[PDB]
């Protein structure tokens, strides 16, 4: 009691089993008189260094010192810090040259939107262009299309600028996108191409000594199966946005893993507010 720590995250077991609160960068036993004061009441796990899969620890989160871009909703150690980026396209254009092969080139105008809490830092969304069953092509964005420091709730070219142009099927920007001949006679009559995303990558920031943050080497590519495997997803619509969160859940099958359990009626509240 207040003297042992089997997980090594700077929060003793009793606090991690009864509730606590950070007061000037030190854990404090949760009292009932802080609720009016404006504080909160977190609980978490006492056998892991970080009980939500996400790359920030229980103490680093609860204290609120991981970063100054992540929403406040992502501090309660039972809520993952996870971004969700998608790609919406339009204004697809063609260009002919007037050859039964490579008879036309394509071009698309894309824009990335993001929902969630934490921001990505160098995004490269792999997307495929599909036509009426036949996958026309796949493409991973090169250096002309990487979008650095995308935020939560916004789009890559901010509201006020033009969409982005994707035309190139090569690791260096060259060799414009080709197309068959029949597929040109198939999109002149009635049909039109579609664009769908399949995966996205991109680093994630992390603090250092004097702030001195670094974002080179860390990667969201390996904390995604771990989070998608244990958490549970929740979505909300507002006719103006698309809120989306993850919340961890206790697996009752094994009699060993120890982690609190919630109610959907409380999961929703703890997720959005």
């Amino acid at each position: 009691d207040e003297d042992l720590d089997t997980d090594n995250d700077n929060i003793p077991d009793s606090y991690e089993r009864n509730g606590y609160t950070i007061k000037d960068l030190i854990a404090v036993k949760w009292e009932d008189s802080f609720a009016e004061q404006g504080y909160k009441k977190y609980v978490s796990n006492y056998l892991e260094s970080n009980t939500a899969g996400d790359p920030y620890t229980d103490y680093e989160k609860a204290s609120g010192s991981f970063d100054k871009a992540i929403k406040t909703e992502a501090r309660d150690p039972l809520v993952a810090a996870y971004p969700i980026v998608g790609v919406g396209m339009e204004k697809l254009i063609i260009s002919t040259n007037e050859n039964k092969g490579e008879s036309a080139y394509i071009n698309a105008n894309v824009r990335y939107y993001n929902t969630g809490t934490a921001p990505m830092y160098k995004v490269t969304p792999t997307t495929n262009l599909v036509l009426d069953g036949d996958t026309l092509s796949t493409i991973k964005a090169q250096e002309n299309q990487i979008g650095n420091n995308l935020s939560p709730g916004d789009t890559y070219p901010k509201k006020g600028l033009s969409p982005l142009a994707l035309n190139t099927m090569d690791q260096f920007s060259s060799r414009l996108i080709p197309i068959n001949y029949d597929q040109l006679k198939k999109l002149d009559a009635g049909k039109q191409i579609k664009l769908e995303t399949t995966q996205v990558s991109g680093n994630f920031g992390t603090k250092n000594s004097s702030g001195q943050i670094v974002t080179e080497g860390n990667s969201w590519s390996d904390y995604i199966s771990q989070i998608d495997s244990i958490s549970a997803s929740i979505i909300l619509d507002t006719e103006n946005e698309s809120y989306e969160r993850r919340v961890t859940a206790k697996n009752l099958q094994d009699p060993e893993d120890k982690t609190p359990e919630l109610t959907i009626g409380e999961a929703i509240e703890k997720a959005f507010g």
Binding site: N8, D9, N10, S209
Partner: protein
């Protein structure tokens, strides 16, 4: 991680940079000097040549402090933990059950101290081409401790300043590339010590003991002040005579009760280490008995046989000094008892009264017990002296 290695090695000033460079050339002497520093006069401390280097290395270490308990691994001679014999030579392969039993027995419940510089690795000890002694140790480090990695020629071994007290918990017998080895798993027990900083010593002493003077009665205050000014010279002598049994007297008895009441009311608030300069009288010696000399090896080894480990018992009160610096009045005594004190022992601060009664001194109840840990020798001028790290058992 040579990245952080080099990235940390430019936030320094020229002095620190050249000193960390020179550390790769004068390691062992720097270490051994940093071991026994504060046990001199105030004279040579601010006067010795290798002071700039100790100072700059300390201010280099103290900069970078970690934020979570972190594990370290290093090989350790079995001598430091009270084992003055062999477990196996460097050409055998395995250790015997008898020696293992002996070791497991002789370190049952102790608390050892470490106060020098140190190099340290972090990964497991694989083919590092360095594993001298058969006692690996697997240690833990608490929050907010110093750590500074130098980017050596090919290896990157970090450098710490062990200034704390450890205790051994768990020992096992493992094998590595054919040979046998013992592995111990130790932690760090917190201690508060002022090696030299006596201004902070006085600050702590006052801030903790000033408000205590009003937990007594004016006759008790007057009497204890009497006993603290001059009476000791005679009073405690009565205690040596085994008064209350052989020759009774109630006057000095009531005086004793005054002191004991005055001491019991307020304990020490935190683990505190005290330094009392003792002499030959207290240890079955004089300035005449041949054993008192500590230049020759046979005397030292006979002493380390007799007293090391055995218990010590005191009939009178203990007036200890906090500042570990050698003062003038003890230029003849050659033993520096170094006691540790837990949160919960009686006593008070005699230098809490405005008025000459003692320069940073603390009281410890009479008729007490000490369990001794380890005896070491340190050189000064022509003569060596015996540092005796001994624990106060409650």
């Amino acid at each position: 991680e040579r990245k952080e290695a080099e990235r940390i090695e430019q936030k320094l000033e020229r002095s620190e940079k050249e000193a960390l460079e020179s550390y790769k050339k004068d390691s062992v002497e720097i270490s051994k000097y940093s071991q026994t520093r504060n046990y001199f006069y105030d004279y040579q401390i601010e006067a010795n040549s290798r002071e700039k280097e100790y100072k700059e290395l300390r201010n280099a270490i103290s900069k970078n402090k970690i934020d979570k308990p972190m594990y370290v691994y290093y090989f350790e001679s079995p001598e430091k933990f009270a084992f003055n014999k062999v477990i196996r030579t460097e050409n055998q392969n395995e250790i015997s059950l008898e020696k293992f039993n002996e070791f497991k027995e002789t370190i049952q419940n102790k608390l050892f101290k470490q106060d020098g510089f140190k190099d340290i690795s972090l990964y497991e000890p694989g083919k590092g081409d360095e594993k001298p002694t058969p006692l690996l140790m697997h240690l833990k480090l608490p929050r907010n401790t110093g750590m500074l990695p130098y980017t050596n020629t090919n290896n990157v071994s970090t450098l710490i300043e062990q200034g704390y007290s450890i205790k051994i918990d768990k020992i096992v017998r493992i094998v590595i590339d054919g040979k046998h080895y013992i592995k111990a798993e130790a932690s760090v027990v917190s201690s508060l010590d002022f090696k030299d900083d006596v201004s902070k010593g006085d600050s702590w002493g006052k801030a903790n003991y000033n408000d205590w003077s009003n937990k007594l009665t004016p006759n008790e205050l007057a009497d204890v002040n009497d006993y603290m000014r001059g009476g000791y010279t005679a009073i405690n002598n009565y205690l040596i005579s085994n008064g209350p049994v052989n020759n009774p007297n109630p006057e000095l008895d009531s005086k004793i009760t005054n002191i004991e009441n005055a001491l019991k009311r307020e304990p020490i608030p935190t683990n505190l280490t005290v330094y009392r300069r003792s002499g030959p009288q207290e240890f079955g010696l004089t300035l005449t008995s041949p054993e008192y000399d500590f230049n020759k090896l046979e005397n030292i080894d006979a002493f380390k046989s007799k007293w090391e480990g055995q218990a010590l018992s005191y009939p009178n009160f203990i007036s200890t000094s906090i500042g570990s610096v050698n003062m003038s009045a003890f230029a003849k005594r050659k033993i520096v008892l170094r006691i540790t004190i837990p949160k919960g022992s009686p006593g008070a601060y005699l230098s809490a009264i405005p008025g000459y009664a003692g320069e940073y001194e603390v009281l410890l109840n009479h008729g007490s017990k000490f369990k001794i840990n380890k005896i070491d020798s340190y050189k000064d001028g022509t003569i060596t002296k015996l540092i005796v790290d001994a624990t106060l058992i409650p």
